[PDB]
Design a protein around this motif. Structure first.
Motif, PDB file in Angstrom:
ATOM      1  N   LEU A  53       0.828  -1.207   0.000  1.00  0.00           N
ATOM      2  CA  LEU A  53       0.000   0.000   0.000  1.00  0.00           C
ATOM      3  C   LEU A  53       0.870   1.269   0.000  1.00  0.00           C
ATOM      4  O   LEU A  53       0.591   2.184  -0.775  1.00  0.00           O
ATOM      5  CB  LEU A  53      -0.960  -0.039   1.207  1.00  0.00           C
ATOM      6  CG  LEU A  53      -1.970   1.120   1.256  1.00  0.00           C
ATOM      7  CD1 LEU A  53      -3.046   0.957   0.182  1.00  0.00           C
ATOM      8  CD2 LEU A  53      -2.674   1.165   2.611  1.00  0.00           C
ATOM      9  N   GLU A  54       1.931   1.304   0.808  1.00  0.00           N
ATOM     10  CA  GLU A  54       2.899   2.407   0.878  1.00  0.00           C
ATOM     11  C   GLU A  54       3.601   2.635  -0.471  1.00  0.00           C
ATOM     12  O   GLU A  54       3.627   3.760  -0.976  1.00  0.00           O
ATOM     13  CB  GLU A  54       3.925   2.112   1.992  1.00  0.00           C
ATOM     14  CG  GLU A  54       4.803   3.332   2.305  1.00  0.00           C
ATOM     15  CD  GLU A  54       5.989   3.022   3.231  1.00  0.00           C
ATOM     16  OE1 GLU A  54       7.017   3.741   3.101  1.00  0.00           O
ATOM     17  OE2 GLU A  54       5.930   2.069   4.029  1.00  0.00           O
ATOM     18  N   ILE A  55       4.112   1.577  -1.111  1.00  0.00           N
ATOM     19  CA  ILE A  55       4.778   1.654  -2.425  1.00  0.00           C
ATOM     20  C   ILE A  55       3.839   2.273  -3.470  1.00  0.00           C
ATOM     21  O   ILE A  55       4.229   3.194  -4.191  1.00  0.00           O
ATOM     22  CB  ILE A  55       5.265   0.253  -2.872  1.00  0.00           C
ATOM     23  CG1 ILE A  55       6.399  -0.271  -1.964  1.00  0.00           C
ATOM     24  CG2 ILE A  55       5.776   0.272  -4.327  1.00  0.00           C
ATOM     25  CD1 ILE A  55       6.604  -1.787  -2.092  1.00  0.00           C
ATOM     26  N   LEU A  56       2.588   1.804  -3.532  1.00  0.00           N
ATOM     27  CA  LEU A  56       1.591   2.306  -4.482  1.00  0.00           C
ATOM     28  C   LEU A  56       1.176   3.752  -4.171  1.00  0.00           C
ATOM     29  O   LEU A  56       1.062   4.565  -5.091  1.00  0.00           O
ATOM     30  CB  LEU A  56       0.374   1.366  -4.490  1.00  0.00           C
ATOM     31  CG  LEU A  56       0.653  -0.055  -5.019  1.00  0.00           C
ATOM     32  CD1 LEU A  56      -0.599  -0.909  -4.821  1.00  0.00           C
ATOM     33  CD2 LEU A  56       1.034  -0.096  -6.500  1.00  0.00           C
ATOM     34  N   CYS A  57       1.010   4.112  -2.893  1.00  0.00           N
ATOM     35  CA  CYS A  57       0.736   5.493  -2.484  1.00  0.00           C
ATOM     36  C   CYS A  57       1.881   6.433  -2.887  1.00  0.00           C
ATOM     37  O   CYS A  57       1.642   7.517  -3.425  1.00  0.00           O
ATOM     38  CB  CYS A  57       0.502   5.562  -0.966  1.00  0.00           C
ATOM     39  SG  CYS A  57      -1.094   4.814  -0.535  1.00  0.00           S
ATOM     40  N   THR A  75      -9.289   1.663  -0.328  1.00  0.00           N
ATOM     41  CA  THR A  75      -8.194   1.550   0.650  1.00  0.00           C
ATOM     42  C   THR A  75      -7.066   2.531   0.334  1.00  0.00           C
ATOM     43  O   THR A  75      -6.583   3.213   1.235  1.00  0.00           O
ATOM     44  CB  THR A  75      -7.650   0.112   0.701  1.00  0.00           C
ATOM     45  OG1 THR A  75      -8.695  -0.802   0.951  1.00  0.00           O
ATOM     46  CG2 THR A  75      -6.634  -0.097   1.823  1.00  0.00           C
ATOM     47  N   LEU A  76      -6.704   2.689  -0.948  1.00  0.00           N
ATOM     48  CA  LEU A  76      -5.752   3.725  -1.370  1.00  0.00           C
ATOM     49  C   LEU A  76      -6.270   5.128  -1.040  1.00  0.00           C
ATOM     50  O   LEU A  76      -5.558   5.920  -0.434  1.00  0.00           O
ATOM     51  CB  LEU A  76      -5.482   3.631  -2.877  1.00  0.00           C
ATOM     52  CG  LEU A  76      -4.517   2.513  -3.289  1.00  0.00           C
ATOM     53  CD1 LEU A  76      -4.498   2.478  -4.807  1.00  0.00           C
ATOM     54  CD2 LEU A  76      -3.077   2.769  -2.850  1.00  0.00           C
ATOM     55  N   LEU A  77      -7.529   5.422  -1.378  1.00  0.00           N
ATOM     56  CA  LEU A  77      -8.146   6.725  -1.109  1.00  0.00           C
ATOM     57  C   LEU A  77      -8.246   7.048   0.388  1.00  0.00           C
ATOM     58  O   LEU A  77      -8.307   8.220   0.750  1.00  0.00           O
ATOM     59  CB  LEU A  77      -9.545   6.761  -1.745  1.00  0.00           C
ATOM     60  CG  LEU A  77      -9.535   6.804  -3.280  1.00  0.00           C
ATOM     61  CD1 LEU A  77     -10.944   6.524  -3.805  1.00  0.00           C
ATOM     62  CD2 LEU A  77      -9.066   8.159  -3.812  1.00  0.00           C
ATOM     63  N   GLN A  78      -8.271   6.036   1.258  1.00  0.00           N
ATOM     64  CA  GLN A  78      -8.306   6.202   2.712  1.00  0.00           C
ATOM     65  C   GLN A  78      -6.916   6.379   3.337  1.00  0.00           C
ATOM     66  O   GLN A  78      -6.834   6.997   4.404  1.00  0.00           O
ATOM     67  CB  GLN A  78      -9.059   5.019   3.339  1.00  0.00           C
ATOM     68  CG  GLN A  78     -10.570   5.138   3.088  1.00  0.00           C
ATOM     69  CD  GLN A  78     -11.355   3.905   3.524  1.00  0.00           C
ATOM     70  OE1 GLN A  78     -10.878   2.984   4.162  1.00  0.00           O
ATOM     71  NE2 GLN A  78     -12.632   3.845   3.215  1.00  0.00           N
ATOM     72  N   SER A  79      -5.841   5.940   2.670  1.00  0.00           N
ATOM     73  CA  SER A  79      -4.462   6.026   3.170  1.00  0.00           C
ATOM     74  C   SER A  79      -4.100   7.439   3.641  1.00  0.00           C
ATOM     75  O   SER A  79      -4.380   8.433   2.962  1.00  0.00           O
ATOM     76  CB  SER A  79      -3.475   5.567   2.090  1.00  0.00           C
ATOM     77  OG  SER A  79      -2.152   5.701   2.572  1.00  0.00           O
ATOM     78  N   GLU A  80      -3.494   7.554   4.826  1.00  0.00           N
ATOM     79  CA  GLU A  80      -3.041   8.839   5.378  1.00  0.00           C
ATOM     80  C   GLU A  80      -1.959   9.488   4.511  1.00  0.00           C
ATOM     81  O   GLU A  80      -1.875  10.715   4.435  1.00  0.00           O
ATOM     82  CB  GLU A  80      -2.508   8.666   6.806  1.00  0.00           C
ATOM     83  CG  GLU A  80      -3.605   8.231   7.789  1.00  0.00           C
ATOM     84  CD  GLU A  80      -3.196   8.389   9.263  1.00  0.00           C
ATOM     85  OE1 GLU A  80      -4.115   8.294  10.109  1.00  0.00           O
ATOM     86  OE2 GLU A  80      -2.014   8.700   9.529  1.00  0.00           O
ATOM     87  N   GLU A  81      -1.180   8.684   3.784  1.00  0.00           N
ATOM     88  CA  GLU A  81      -0.133   9.196   2.917  1.00  0.00           C
ATOM     89  C   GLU A  81      -0.688  10.146   1.847  1.00  0.00           C
ATOM     90  O   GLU A  81      -0.083  11.181   1.581  1.00  0.00           O
ATOM     91  CB  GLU A  81       0.615   8.041   2.249  1.00  0.00           C
ATOM     92  CG  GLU A  81       1.496   7.222   3.215  1.00  0.00           C
ATOM     93  CD  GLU A  81       2.770   6.723   2.518  1.00  0.00           C
ATOM     94  OE1 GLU A  81       3.813   6.640   3.196  1.00  0.00           O
ATOM     95  OE2 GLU A  81       2.757   6.642   1.267  1.00  0.00           O
ATOM     96  N   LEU A  82      -1.850   9.846   1.258  1.00  0.00           N
ATOM     97  CA  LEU A  82      -2.432  10.604   0.145  1.00  0.00           C
ATOM     98  C   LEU A  82      -3.258  11.831   0.582  1.00  0.00           C
ATOM     99  O   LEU A  82      -4.018  12.373  -0.218  1.00  0.00           O
ATOM    100  CB  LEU A  82      -3.231   9.650  -0.770  1.00  0.00           C
ATOM    101  CG  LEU A  82      -2.420   8.506  -1.410  1.00  0.00           C
ATOM    102  CD1 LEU A  82      -3.319   7.688  -2.331  1.00  0.00           C
ATOM    103  CD2 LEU A  82      -1.266   9.015  -2.272  1.00  0.00           C
ATOM    104  N   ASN A  83      -3.127  12.305   1.830  1.00  0.00           N
ATOM    105  CA  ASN A  83      -3.954  13.388   2.387  1.00  0.00           C
ATOM    106  C   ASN A  83      -4.028  14.665   1.520  1.00  0.00           C
ATOM    107  O   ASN A  83      -5.082  15.297   1.478  1.00  0.00           O
ATOM    108  CB  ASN A  83      -3.454  13.719   3.809  1.00  0.00           C
ATOM    109  CG  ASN A  83      -4.000  12.800   4.896  1.00  0.00           C
ATOM    110  OD1 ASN A  83      -4.991  12.099   4.733  1.00  0.00           O
ATOM    111  ND2 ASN A  83      -3.403  12.821   6.063  1.00  0.00           N
ATOM    112  N   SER A  84      -2.959  15.034   0.802  1.00  0.00           N
ATOM    113  CA  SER A  84      -2.963  16.193  -0.107  1.00  0.00           C
ATOM    114  C   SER A  84      -3.826  15.997  -1.358  1.00  0.00           C
ATOM    115  O   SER A  84      -4.335  16.972  -1.907  1.00  0.00           O
ATOM    116  CB  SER A  84      -1.531  16.536  -0.537  1.00  0.00           C
ATOM    117  OG  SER A  84      -0.913  15.404  -1.119  1.00  0.00           O
TER     118      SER A  84
END
Lengths: 285, 46
Positions: free
Chosen positions: A200-204, A253-262
């Protein structure tokens, strides 16, 4: 006796003592004495009549046994010793690579049956494949991190993934993220590292490399995103024959990831991500 | 005295891209490995 033979350069007298005092472990004493005095060349240049005792002595000294095994034409043993030394080597990347290459050459020079030789060559080729991910690290990233491939340790799969996807890798392309995804297969089940979280991190991090802004709202979102690193990673996974439906996290799950907040505030990103997911999932079905 | 680059010849000859190992006889391949060992011994002396 050893000091006199060495001061007089009397090798014939020394060999006579190896025979006369054989029951008193004189050979083992002589080998320890050569090791302690740093005379490794004389230790390995012993006559063929002493190779059995030298082999037994060198079993406590793996870093030297392979040299004797090669000189004695015992290539199958030399291969195993070099493979064990390569497996134990974590401190120097170039040394591990050299030991695997020597272990492979020893296997290829041995009388292994073709089926067993192929198995041992495949086992080494798999380790060489793993090490190719460290060797192919971007030279500029190595310079910026002050890492030298000749002096650096062997990195764990997680540390290599982090280097491929890190923000300092300013030129990360679809192949760097593909190598980070390929490196997931080397993370063992006993690791404290969640492979699904790291995937998930790699894809984000792949998604973050592209600008998801609507360039002039007339382009098909699928055509506009075709050149993105994330879409090229999806295309590469599909070209490798990987089932995207089982392999990829849900688009939610990608759209919920904290990494993609911007990017969460961008309705065009949400639409384009879902459209690419549906498109590439339909191209596979 | 480029002994490190001598050893990279093993990677080139064994490469699946060029399949150079298929053109060597078993005797020449043994002689090449013996020559590479001579270069590895000079690296140990260093």
């Amino acid at each position: 006796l050893v000091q006199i033979c060495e001061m007089t350069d009397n090798q014939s007298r020394l060999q006579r003592y190896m025979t006369l005092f054989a029951e008193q472990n004189f050979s083992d004493f002589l080998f320890r004495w050569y090791l302690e005095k740093g005379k490794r060349g004389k230790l390995l240049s012993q006559p063929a009549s002493q190779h059995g005792q030298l082999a037994a002595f060198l079993q406590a000294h793996d870093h030297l046994s392979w040299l004797h095994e090669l000189n004695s034409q015992e290539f199958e043993k030399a291969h195993r010793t070099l493979q064990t030394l390569a497996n134990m080597e974590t401190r120097y990347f170039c040394k591990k690579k050299t030991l695997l290459g020597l272990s492979k050459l020893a296997a290829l020079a041995s009388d292994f049956q073709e089926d067993v030789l192929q198995e041992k060559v495949e086992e080494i080729a798999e380790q060489e494949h793993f090490l190719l991910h460290q060797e192919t690290l971007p030279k500029k990233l190595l310079e910026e991190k002050q890492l030298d491939l000749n002096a650096m340790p062997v990195l764990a799969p997680f540390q290599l993934i982090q280097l491929y996807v890190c923000e300092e890798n300013k030129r990360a392309n679809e192949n760097d993220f593909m190598k980070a995804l390929d490196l997931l297969e080397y993370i063992g089940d006993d690791s404290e590292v969640d492979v699904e979280e790291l995937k998930l991190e790699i894809l984000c991090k792949a998604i973050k490399r592209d600008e998801w802004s609507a360039t002039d709202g007339k382009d098909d979102p699928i055509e506009a995103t075709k050149d993105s690193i994330f879409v090229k990673v999806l295309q590469n996974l599909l070209n490798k024959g990987i089932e995207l439906k089982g392999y990829l996290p849900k688009a939610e799950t990608l759209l919920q990831s904290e990494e993609l907040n911007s990017l969460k505030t961008n309705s065009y990103f949400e639409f384009s991500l879902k459209a690419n997911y549906e498109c590439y999932m339909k191209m596979q079905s | 005295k480029q002994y490190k680059d001598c050893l990279r010849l093993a990677d080139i000859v064994s490469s699946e891209n060029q399949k150079l190992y298929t053109v060597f006889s078993k005797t020449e391949m043994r002689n090449l490995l013996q020559k590479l060992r001579e270069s590895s011994l000079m690296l140990l002396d260093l």
